[PDB]
RNA sequence: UGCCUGGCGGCCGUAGCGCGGUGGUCCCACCUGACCCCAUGCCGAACUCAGAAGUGAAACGCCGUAGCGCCGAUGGUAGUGUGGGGUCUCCCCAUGCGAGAGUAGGGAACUGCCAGGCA
RNA sequence: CCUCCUAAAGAGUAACGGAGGAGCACGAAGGUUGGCUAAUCCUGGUCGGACAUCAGGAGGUUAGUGCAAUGGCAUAAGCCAGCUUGACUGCGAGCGUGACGGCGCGAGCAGGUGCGAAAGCAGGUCAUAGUGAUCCGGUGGUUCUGAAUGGAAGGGCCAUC
RNA sequence: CCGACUUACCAACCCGAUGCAAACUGCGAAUACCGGAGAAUGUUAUCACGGGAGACACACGGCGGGUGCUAACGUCCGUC
RNA sequence: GCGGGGUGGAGCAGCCGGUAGCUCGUCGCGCUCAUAACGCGAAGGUCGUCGGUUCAAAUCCGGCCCCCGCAACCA
RNA sequence: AAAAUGGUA
RNA sequence: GUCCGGAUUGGAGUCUGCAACUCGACUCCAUGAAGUCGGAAUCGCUAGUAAUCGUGGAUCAGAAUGCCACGGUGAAUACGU
């Protein structure tokens, strides 16, 4: 379950999630799972979607995870009011914008990755697409 | 803090004085400076005295 | 480097003379020769210049790298400035110590007529 | 100046032909000899460092420089700016006088002298040796010796690498094994 | 060389056991006598078998 | 619970006061700054708190100058 | 008038590093001696003085060479002021402004004053 | 009260928003003149070691700043020494920032001074925190006043607590 | 005393590629703001001084945000 | 939510940084026919667990876990 | 002054 | 910590014994450790005794600081229960 080993700051502004993504091409593998929609990827989702690929291919080939959950998301507990300070960090997310390549796979036939990426995409809250490496 | 106030009295007998601070515990020697006395309009010696 | 470390020693006084907008008498010293230049306040035009590499001065000197030569250059550069109506400069030791040949050159330039 | 004459009269012509140097200025020279004495046991008693200092002055005939800690280190219990050593720099004539005494008088007195390691060049032609016993220099009176001191001798050479630095010292019949 | 801070540095005479006499400058003051030098040391001058023990002792 | 934050300091109103080409009087502050982010050029002085002020009447002029590409403010006489 | 060298500048990497070569009449540098003027919290290393035997080794100057650094379009892209719109956490259209990065490419600085040497 | 972010590229801008600090220190840690340049790592070196002192190299400010953070700093504002008291008195064109009380910067003038050969620099400290109105009263100076008059008490002004 | 192999192994600095940042910046807009000049327009619309106030509980909508759950006809700012 | 803590095997100190102590317990020797008591001598924590600061942390600061107490209200 | 104890046959 | 002490170790040997590796005694040369009078506690001894110094024997090829004997010098103290 990915998480920064150390961070200079514990909490962070909510921010916004506008724009398109940087890192839209397949760089390390030959096939990729690209993000078509916009949203957040929780580290549990990235772990759950990676476990679905890694047993679908039976650990033959290699998996690259291109996103990292480095943004802490805090929540207030139940039945507390507003205010009285910012909440406590509960989990970490990655901000995903259209075109972001989420995973890459190599050492497998295409038909096996299209199935493996389909299982992973069932655990993710974002619309995805299957992409392959281009010579340029 | 531990740096308490002193007054520097002119040696010209004019009664003019400057006020500063000194750390007694590390500099127990009396402070001697050659300041300007506006009563005589000359630079004379100022000797430390208690505020 | 000696030359670079001397330039560092020199630039603090040179920038100050730029803000004052002062005419600058720049002395350069080598083990063999000594030099002098009076420079306009802009810094890019040389009014007068005397040095031991000129036959007018070097001819009357047994050696051009002693203090007796520095008094020759200091005297000559002062007279050349006086006939051009400078008469008021600021000495730029240019990184050398104000001592020996550099001091001897300024002393000649002073008693010859330059005010600094 | 006996070795300065020896260098200017026989060493150079030897190193002129051995390395086929274009200019005589290309032959390595000896710049300085620095004697170091780490007196890290001076934190307990300051007298020991001054006792070690007059020992070093008698060796070199030159007042040493009491060095002090560059930064505070926990392990050795020293503060920045505490005097924990001394050193001497020998140049010009004093360098050659001391170098002769080390070669001809001191190093034959080194107990069980099996030679000097030829591996002790730092890669730029500078030879650092260590002395276990200050009593190898006849200036130190064995009766008057209070504690066994040592000292660090370093020769700084113009040489560009170890190999031509080794040659220059060998020309002064330096006792490499 | 600054004045009056240095040990006295005067010419001495070093006479060795092997008869070599060398004139040097030093701070010791008196005349010095050497027992060994670079002209007489074993390392400087150049003066520094189980079967063979068996056969010699056990001739047969 | 409670908060361990909550402190701040009043704003110091730093920055550029007169801009490029502005006519200023002598002694008028041009830029208040922490440190010499701008440097004093001709007819311009620097205060103890690194405030830059005009030492003559004229126009403010900003220019990048020197080997370090530092910004300088100078006064151009009318 | 040209080549060279020194000083002071302008400009502030297209100008700086690297690599390879070249310079000693003059200049410059190292270099030689130091009781001295002066100096080292020890050291003539540095600063300084009196010089001129040697050398261009180092430093510096110049020449060449894209290994870097550096500069850098055109087009597109992102963003965005104004008006309008939607499927409104984000976008689209008209209009104006328009990057950053990267690409092609450029690129081994240019120049003023004075002084000296050789021609 | 100070520093950063929020804060939307002038200023300013809220929340029981997100992070830290101050309530001092220094007669040198202030002024000037002269000089100097860091962290770290590698190699060689007596004790000596991962880490002390020494020598050389690479590096290029990654150090340092009396104390937070930011903005600065090589002409160094960082490090070292000599001499010193400008950590001066009266003012002050002009400006900044505040509803105001107030707070800040300031060339130049007059008097006297320190360092420097000089040009110059110096009205505290790299800057921004280190603070408390008025009343009341204490201490020193100054006849300015002094309830018939001469003093005096008391008040005022100036310095300070 | 040295030391020698081996790796379910872990892995520094450097090198190449790939991302992220309110409290990162070797870059860098549009707008906004400050100043100058010019034309047209505007019942001086500007500034100063004096008389009289009231107000200092704001609401929602767009855009830029903090907080909340990018919940709230929520809460707190900026701007229209 | 707020205050207190965690240190040889146990119970308490040492917390303003430097240089870990007391009682019992444990071990060896002695006394005793033997054990206890007693006598002599010695060993044993490098300070709950990490991060930060510092030249240096049991000590200062911050998270984490554990063990404790106070408070957890008004309709 | 102090002196406690001794599994079974 | 010595011209005290003589442990340990290296080298060279001798003798006994078929055979000195484990595992003999002695000799030579070199080495030169702890140890500076010993905590609680505890032992022997009343006279030729204790202490101290040598000698011999049995066992036994070789292998005693042990055991068993022999002489030399030769104390102190016993108020008392
Ligand atoms: Mg010289
Ligand atoms: Mg060369
Ligand atoms: Mg571009
Ligand atoms: Mg080049
Ligand atoms: Mg702003
Ligand atoms: Mg704005
Ligand atoms: Mg407002
Ligand atoms: Mg300071
Ligand atoms: Mg200075
Ligand atoms: Mg200073
Ligand atoms: Mg400060
Ligand atoms: Mg009266
Ligand atoms: Mg009064
Ligand atoms: Mg209100
Ligand atoms: Mg409102
Ligand atoms: Mg509302
Ligand atoms: Mg019982
Ligand atoms: Mg023996
Ligand atoms: Mg002992
Ligand atoms: Mg004894
Ligand atoms: Mg009896
Ligand atoms: Mg006996
Ligand atoms: Mg027998
Ligand atoms: Zn000899």
From TrEMBL, chain B:
The keyword Ribonucleoprotein is annotated on this UniProt entry: yes
GO cellular component term of the entry, any: cytosolic large ribosomal subunit
Keywords noted in UniProt: Ribonucleoprotein, Ribosomal protein
PROSITE patterns from the UniProt entry: RIBOSOMAL_L33
GO biological process terms held by the UniProt record: translation
GO-annotated molecular function: structural constituent of ribosome
HAMAP family: Ribosomal_bL33
Similarity section: Belongs to the bacterial ribosomal protein bL33 family.
Protein name stated in the entry: Large ribosomal subunit protein bL33
Native source species: Escherichia coli
Automatic annotation (TrEMBL), chain C:
Cell wall biogenesis/degradation keyword on record: no
UniProtKB keywords: Ribonucleoprotein, Ribosomal protein, RNA-binding, rRNA-binding
Keyword RNA-binding part of the UniProt annotation: yes
Gene3D superfamilies: 3.30.420.100
Gene Ontology biological-process entries: translation
Signal peptide extent: none
Listed InterPro entries: Ribosomal_L18, Ribosomal_uL18_bac-type, Ribosomal_uL18_bac/plant/anim
Any one cellular-component term (Gene Ontology): cytosolic large ribosomal subunit
GO terms of molecular function: 5S rRNA binding; structural constituent of ribosome
Coiled coil: none
Pfam families: Ribosomal_L18p (PF00861)
Entries under HAMAP family matching the protein: Ribosomal_uL18_B
Function, in words: This is one of the proteins that bind and probably mediate the attachment of the 5S RNA into the large ribosomal subunit, where it forms part of the central protuberance.
NCBIfam families: L18_bact
Self-association state and partner proteins as the record states: Part of the 50S ribosomal subunit; part of the 5S rRNA/L5/L18/L25 subcomplex. Contacts the 5S and 23S rRNAs.
Family the entry assigns: Belongs to the universal ribosomal protein uL18 family.
Protein name: Large ribosomal subunit protein uL18
């Amino acid at each position: 379950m990915l998480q920064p080993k150390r961070t200079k700051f514990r909490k962070m502004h909510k921010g916004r999630n506008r724009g398109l993504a940087q890192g839209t091409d397949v760089s390390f593998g030959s096939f990729g799972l690209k993000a078509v929609g916009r949203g957040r990827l929780t580290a549990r989702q990235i772990e759950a979607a990676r476990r679905a690929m890694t047993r679908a291919v039976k650990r033959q080939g290699k998996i690259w995870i291109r996103v990292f959950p480095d943004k802490p998301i805090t929540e207030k507990p139940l039945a507390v009011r507003m205010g009285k300070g910012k909440g406590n960090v509960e989990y970490w997310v990655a901000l995903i914008q259209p075109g972001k390549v989420l995973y890459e796979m190599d050492g497998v036939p295409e038909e096996l990755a299209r199935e493996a990426f389909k299982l992973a995409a069932a655990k993710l809250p974002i619309k995805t697409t299957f992409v392959t490496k281009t010579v340029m | 803090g531990i740096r308490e106030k002193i007054k520097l009295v002119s040696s010209a007998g004019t009664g003019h004085f400057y006020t500063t601070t000194k750390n007694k515990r590390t500099k127990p020697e009396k402070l001697e400076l050659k300041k300007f006395d506006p009563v005589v309009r000359q630079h004379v010696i100022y000797k430390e005295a208690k505020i | 480097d000696k030359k670079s470390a001397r330039i560092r020693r020199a630039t603090r006084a040179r920038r100050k003379l730029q803000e004052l907008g002062a005419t600058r008498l720049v002395v350069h010293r080598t083990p063999r020769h000594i030099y002098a230049q009076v420079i306009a306040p802009n810094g890019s035009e040389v009014l007068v210049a005397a040095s031991t590499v000129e036959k007018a001065i070097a001819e009357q000197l047994k050696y051009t790298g002693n203090k007796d030569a520095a008094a020759a250059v200091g005297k000559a550069v002062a007279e050349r400035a006086l006939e051009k109506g400078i008469k008021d400069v600021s000495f730029d030791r240019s990184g050398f110590q104000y001592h020996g040949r550099v001091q001897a050159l300024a002393d000649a330039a002073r008693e010859a007529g330059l005010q600094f | 100046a006996k070795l300065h004459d020896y260098y200017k009269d026989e060493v150079v012509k030897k190193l002129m032909t051995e390395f086929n140097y274009n200019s005589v200025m290309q032959v390595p020279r000896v710049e300085k000899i620095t004697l170091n004495m780490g007196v890290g046991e001076a934190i307990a008693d300051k007298k020991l460092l001054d006792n070690a200092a007059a020992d070093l002055a008698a060796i070199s005939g030159q007042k040493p420089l009491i060095t002090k800690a560059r930064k505070s280190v926990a392990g050795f219990k020293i503060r920045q700016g505490y005097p924990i050593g001394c050193k001497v720099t020998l140049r010009g004539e004093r360098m050659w006088e001391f170098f002769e005494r080390l070669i001809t008088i001191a190093v034959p007195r080194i107990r069980d002298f099996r030679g000097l390691s030829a591996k002790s060049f730092d890669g730029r032609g500078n030879y650092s040796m260590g002395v276990r016993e200050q009593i190898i220099f006849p200036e130190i009176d064995y009766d008057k010796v209070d504690r066994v001191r040592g000292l660090d001798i370093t020769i700084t050479t113009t040489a560009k690498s170890d190999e031509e630095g080794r040659a220059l010292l060998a020309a002064f019949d330096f006792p490499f094994r | 060389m600054k004045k009056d801070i240095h040990p006295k540095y005067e010419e001495i005479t070093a006479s060795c056991s092997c008869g070599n006499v060398m004139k040097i400058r030093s701070t010791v003051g008196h005349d010095l006598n050497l027992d060994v030098c670079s002209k007489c040391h074993p390392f400087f001058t150049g003066k520094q078998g189980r079967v063979d023990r068996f056969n010699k002792r056990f001739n047969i | 619970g409670s908060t361990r934050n909550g402190r701040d300091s009043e704003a110091k109103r730093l920055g550029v006061k007169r801009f490029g080409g502005e006519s200023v009087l002598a002694g008028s502050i041009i830029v208040r700054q922490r440190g010499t982010k701008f440097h004093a050029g001709a007819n311009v002085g620097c205060g103890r708190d690194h405030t830059l002020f005009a030492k003559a009447d004229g126009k403010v002029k900003f220019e990048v100058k020197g080997p370090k590409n530092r910004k300088f403010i100078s006064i151009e006489a009318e």
